[PDB]
Amino acid sequence: KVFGRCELAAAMKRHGLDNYRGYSLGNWVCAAKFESNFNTQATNRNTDGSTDYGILQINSRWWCNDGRTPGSRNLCNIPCSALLSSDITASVNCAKKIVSDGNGMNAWVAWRNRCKGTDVQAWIRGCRL
Ligand code: NA
């Protein structure tokens, strides 16, 4: 599924991301825009052989099991394919664990380079919510 901007903002709010660990909703919508273009089916392979999955491009070296990242962890206790569902519950729950692990949203390279320090509430302006 490819979300609309305000549709995704509403879904993220319902699942408890607005102000989660101090990050306002616009940060999460900005991160999803540049990580995946709002597409739950996005995948990208990394040079170390791990793959990033889903609307927040969660990585198989630490967070999910894809059966082909030897010597990796599965800290969200999920198959990576669950991160590609049209239902974003699994991605949101795993993202809450990532952002809690000490490094905040700096775990998402696109957030650090394209969202951090910008007017992120622009991403939810005009939305009913
Ligand atoms: Na893994």
> Determination technique for this PDB entry?
X-ray
Domain assignment present for 129: no
- Closest listed residue to residue 97, CA positions, set 49, 72, 64: 64
Q: How far is the CA of 84 from the centre of ligand 1 (A)?
A: 15
The answer to whether 84 and 41 are in contact (CB under 8 A) is: yes
Would residue 7 show up in a list of annotated catalytic residues for this protein? no
Q: How far is the CA of 70 from the centre of ligand 1 (A)?
A: 8
Domain assignment present for 95: yes
If you compute the radius of gyration of the chain from its CA atoms, what whole number of angstroms results? 14
Pairing of strands 51-53, 58-59: antiparallel
User: What range defines the domain where residue 115 resides?
Assistant: 5-124
Per the structure, how many domains does the chain have? 1
Please tell me the distance from the alpha carbon of residue 11 to that of residue 17, in angstroms, as a whole number. 9
Q: How far is the CA of 81 from the centre of ligand 1 (A)?
A: 12
Domain assignment present for 83: yes
Helix (H) or strand (E) holding 101: none
Partners of 59 in the β-ladder: 52
Please tell me the distance from the alpha carbon of residue 11 to that of residue 77, in angstroms, as a whole number. 22
Of 48, 52, 66, 87, the active-site residue reads 52
First to last CA, the chain: 21
Please tell me the distance from the alpha carbon of residue 63 to that of residue 17, in angstroms, as a whole number. 19
CATH code for position 51: 1.10.530.10
Which tokens in the block code for residue 47?
A: 């040079």
